[PDB]
Amino acid sequence: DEVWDALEEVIHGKVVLLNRAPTLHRLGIQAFQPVLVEGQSIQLHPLVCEAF
Amino acid sequence: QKRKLQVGDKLANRHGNKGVVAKILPVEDMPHLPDGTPVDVILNPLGV
């Protein structure tokens, strides 16, 4: 568990970049603050299902 | 391996409703009929 807490510590306020297949304008890639979640897929904010 | 339905999986009806499983609700807090029988799945009407 403490390892996890350290990972969280590492993440802090860093961001990662997310890209979706056919990258047609620059909003084809955007950066987000990562958030650990249960499960096995990436979770996306619905508002920028427009851009990608 | 026995592969239960994890989130991220793909489900679709015969009429061509492609969708991803995106949330697994506990039985307790998902829409149920008058008699305590709950529904199993929840499709957006906006897909139609």
Binding site: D1, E2, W4, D5, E8, L36, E38 | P26, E28, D29
Partner: protein, 232 residues
């Protein structure tokens, strides 16, 4: 699970607004508490409000008043904003008196003092008077709970009197979220945060505690069996 005995933490500023956070809680318990706690807070909390009003020469609720800027309705509206507090159970009600004349700004403090009734709300603007501005009125304040319209309670003081919408419930609003917090390996864990807006009668925290008390109380009701069974 047990040592996870949640942390009830609080941010309370003044007597009108409070944020109460309680985590971590087992899967989907945030709703299990938050939803029925709010149902209590908004209805079954015990308070006071204006229930009916008599104006000297005014007969209908719409009628405008000479010498008075504000129409009847806006005044009764200002009454619906009024918050008093009785000092012992025995005052079932109180018919409050306010008479004043000539160009003054009429505040709630202008209401003539009664022994056991405090006005938490002195500065409230009641109405503005003109030259030749006579006003005279009897405003009944009753004990009660929740919201009760003019229709449902219909209060008789004087035949010229007019019932008022009853804003008993000291709570102004409740709102709440249950967001995810994590605890090590486990992200799905439930973090309940809620917010309570009161008319100043009672602090948010007091409201809460009363409401939970009410809940526990109701839970004690499952203790007096009777027998039956059903079929046809």
């Amino acid at each position: 699970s047990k040592l996870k005995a949640p942390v009830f933490t609080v941010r309370t500023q003044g007597r009108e607004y409070g944020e109460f956070v309680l985590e971590p809680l087992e899967r989907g318990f945030g709703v299990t508490l938050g939803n029925p706690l709010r149902r209590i807070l908004l209805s079954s909390i015990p308070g006071t409000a204006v229930t009916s009003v008599y104006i000297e020469d005014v007969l209908h609720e719409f009628s405008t008043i000479p010498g008075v800027k504000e129409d009847v309705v806006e005044i009764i509206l200002n009454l619906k904003e009024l918050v008093v507090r009785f000092l012992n159970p025995s005052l079932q009600t109180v018919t409050l008196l306010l008479k004043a004349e000539g160009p003054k700004e009429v505040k709630a403090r202008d209401f003539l003092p009664v022994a056991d009734v405090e006005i938490m709300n002195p500065d409230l603007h009641i109405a503005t008077l003109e030259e030749g501005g006579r006003l005279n009125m009897e405003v009944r304040v009753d004990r009660g709970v929740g919201y009760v319209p003019a229709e449902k309670h219909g209060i008789k003081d004087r035949i010229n009197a007019i019932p008022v919408d009853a804003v008993f419930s000291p709570v102004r609003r409740v709102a709440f979220q249950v967001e995810d917090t994590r605890l090590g390996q486990r992200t799905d864990l439930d973090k309940l945060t809620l917010r309570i807006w009161t008319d100043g009668s009672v602090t948010p925290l007091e409201a809460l505690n009363q409401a939970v008390e009410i809940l526990r109380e109701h839970l004690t009701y499952f203790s007096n069996p009777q027998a039956a069974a059903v079929a046809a």
